[PDB]
Structure 1
């Protein structure tokens, strides 16, 4: 008897930690220690999907004496209107009601066109440079920050100002740096709101300013803008890096995709499903039970913390035959859980798929000899950041 402790070691740079796959094999739910509170760890696809749809399991903490949290985690919960369990139902319903129409079919069709041209231009610059090149800096980072600049209606050069702010805000290792970075986000967004009140354009803050005859306050509008800025590029950057690493690991699938770019949608779904980095702490969706819930033979009690392992669930052989294998030819694959599920299902997931599809439609056709210029083991996943990620990806081509 040895209580398992998160985070689990992973000897590889990607995939699921062996200890978590071991727990998965034993059963759907296990009590584990963490750096803070003990929690229930749920690792099988069916149970994770069921619990993500269970409205008794919520982001907000119901407990009278809540355990202490890093500044980074406190910011992420507040951005999601999860910081007050008594007001979360109304505030989170309004949050989703105000953001979902900012990603209409009209907007997404226009953005798809611009995204496709931008990837062509980014890859032309890459192809014309001398290796070794940092693919993370010149491709993975540039496309999703371009998109956020477009959503917010600001010049592209603004991303050189805000491009590290998601990482800084979400640095769980340094509360002072996290708080000081978030204040920069706030000041920037409040400036932007003031500008859009007199100079609106076809962008998100302009739309919120006009919403319900201007009933929203500037603080409310800026809060929603902060969520778009801080959730809207960093995780996409990380999926471009992981997608590239996975395709480089699987030359037969890479060659299938280079030959037929019509396989890119299917490849993007496999990338999201298999794309887990390092110890994979960002592939856990955290919750608290607001009422008792039975999982298998286990009672989760009101107030218990629960870690929903969407990463492990996406590797579950029960839901994906040969769950550890990258396979472009899967017939009717189950919907993976990389965007979550249920009440907090990722609001940007259709836009994120458009970005990833546009990249992997083109990447290995435009750079057929692309490959890492360093050993994989030299690539360092950044465990202290809520969003993880690699800091550089050196390639040759």
Structure 2
């Protein structure tokens, strides 16, 4: 008897930690220690998907004496309207109501066209440069920040100002750096709201300003803008890096995709399913039980913390035959859980899929000899950031 402790070690740079797969083989739910509170860890696909749809399991903490959280985690929860359990129902409902129509089919069609040209230009610059090159800096970072500049209606050079703010805000290791970065985000966004009130354009804050005959306060509008900026590029960057590494590891699949770029949507879905880095602490969705819930023979009690392991569930053999294998020829694969499920299902997921499809339609057709310029084992997943990620990806081509 040894209580497992999150985070678990992973001897590889990607995939699921061996002890989490061990727990998944035993059963769907286990009690575990963490760096803070103990929690229920749910690792099988069926059970994670069912609990993500359970309205008794919520982001907010209902406990009278809530455990302490890092400044980074507190900011994340507040941007998601989860910081007060008594107001979460109304505030979270309004959050989704106001954000979902900012990603209409009209906007996404226009953005797809611009995204495709931008990737073409990014890869032309990459192809003309002399290796070794940092693929993370000149491709993975540049496309999603271009997209956020478009959503916010700001010059592309602004991403040189805000491009590290998601990392800094979500630095769990330094509460002072986290709070100081978040203040820069707030200042920038309040500046942008004030500008869009006199100079609106085809962009998200202009639409929120116009909403309901101007019923929203500037602080309400900026709060929504901060969520778009802080959630809307960094995780996509990480998926471009992980998708590149996964395809480099699977040359038969990579050659299939180079030959037929019509396989890109299927490759993107496999990349999202399998793309988990380092110890994979970002591939857990955190919840608290607001009422008792039974999972198998296990009772989750009101107030208990729950970690829904979307990464491990996406590797679950019960849901994906040979769940550890990258296979873009899967016939009717189950819907993966990398965007979540249920009440908080990712708002940007259709846009994120457009970006990743445009990249992997083009990458290995444009750079057929692309490969790492350093060993995989030298690539360092950044465990202290809520969103993880690699800091650099050196390549040759």
State the TM bucket, normalised to the shorter chain.
over 0.9
What runs of 5+ residues in structure 1 fail to find an aligned partner? none
Q: Deviations over 1:184-242 (max 9, x none)?
A: 00000000000000000000000000000000000000000000000000000000000
Does residue 1:17 correspond to 2:21, yes or no?
no
Using the alignment, how far apart are the partners of 1:252 and 1:264 within structure 2?
Answer: 14
Task: State the secondary structure of the residue aligned to 1:13.
Answer: coil
List 4+ stretches of structure 1 deviating above 4 A.
none
Does residue 1:41 correspond to 2:41, yes or no?
yes
Give 1:256 deviation, angstroms.
0.1
Q: Deviations over 1:77-126 (max 9, x none)?
A: 00000000000000000000000000000000000000000000000000
Task: State the secondary structure of the residue aligned to 1:306.
Answer: strand
Give 1:366 deviation, angstroms.
0.1
Give 1:153 deviation, angstroms.
0.1
Using the alignment, how far apart are the partners of 2:49 and 2:67 within structure 1?
Answer: 26
Task: State the secondary structure of the residue aligned to 2:124.
Answer: helix
Give 1:165 deviation, angstroms.
0.0
Task: State the secondary structure of the residue aligned to 2:41.
Answer: strand
Give the structure 2 partner of residue 254 of structure 1. Answer: 254
Give the structure 2 partner of residue 375 of structure 1. Answer: 375
Using the alignment, how far apart are the partners of 2:338 and 2:209 within structure 1?
Answer: 32
Task: State the secondary structure of the residue aligned to 1:195.
Answer: helix
Q: Deviations over 1:17-66 (max 9, x none)?
A: 00000000000000000000000000000000000000000000000000
Give the structure 2 partner of residue 179 of structure 1. Answer: 179
Does residue 1:272 correspond to 2:259, yes or no?
no
Give 1:154 deviation, angstroms.
0.0
Give 1:361 deviation, angstroms.
0.1
Q: Deviations over 1:254-303 (max 9, x none)?
A: 00000000000000000000000000000000000000000000000000
Using the alignment, how far apart are the partners of 2:11 and 2:82 within structure 1?
Answer: 34
State the superposition RMSD in angstroms. Answer: 0.1
Give 1:312 deviation, angstroms.
0.1
Q: Deviations over 1:147-196 (max 9, x none)?
A: 00000000000000000000000000000000000000000000000000
Give the structure 2 partner of residue 285 of structure 1. Answer: 285
Task: State the secondary structure of the residue aligned to 2:40.
Answer: strand
Using the alignment, how far apart are the partners of 1:273 and 1:260 within structure 2?
Answer: 21
Give 1:132 deviation, angstroms.
0.0
Using the alignment, how far apart are the partners of 1:379 and 1:251 within structure 2?
Answer: 20
Q: Deviations over 1:127-164 (max 9, x none)?
A: 00000000000000000000000000000000000000
Using the alignment, how far apart are the partners of 1:392 and 1:309 within structure 2?
Answer: 26
Using the alignment, how far apart are the partners of 1:329 and 1:361 within structure 2?
Answer: 16
Using the alignment, how far apart are the partners of 1:218 and 1:296 within structure 2?
Answer: 47
TM-score, normalisation: structure 2: 1.00
How many residues are paired up? 397
Give the structure 1 partner of residue 304 of structure 2. Answer: 304
Using the alignment, how far apart are the partners of 2:361 and 2:380 within structure 1?
Answer: 27
Give 1:346 deviation, angstroms.
0.1
Task: State the secondary structure of the residue aligned to 1:62.
Answer: coil
Give 1:386 deviation, angstroms.
0.2
Give 1:320 deviation, angstroms.
0.1
Using the alignment, how far apart are the partners of 2:265 and 2:156 within structure 1?
Answer: 27
Using the alignment, how far apart are the partners of 2:160 and 2:319 within structure 1?
Answer: 41
What runs of 5+ residues in structure 2 fail to find an aligned partner? none
Using the alignment, how far apart are the partners of 2:238 and 2:269 within structure 1?
Answer: 15
Task: State the secondary structure of the residue aligned to 1:46.
Answer: helix
Task: State the secondary structure of the residue aligned to 1:31.
Answer: strand
Give 1:328 deviation, angstroms.
0.6
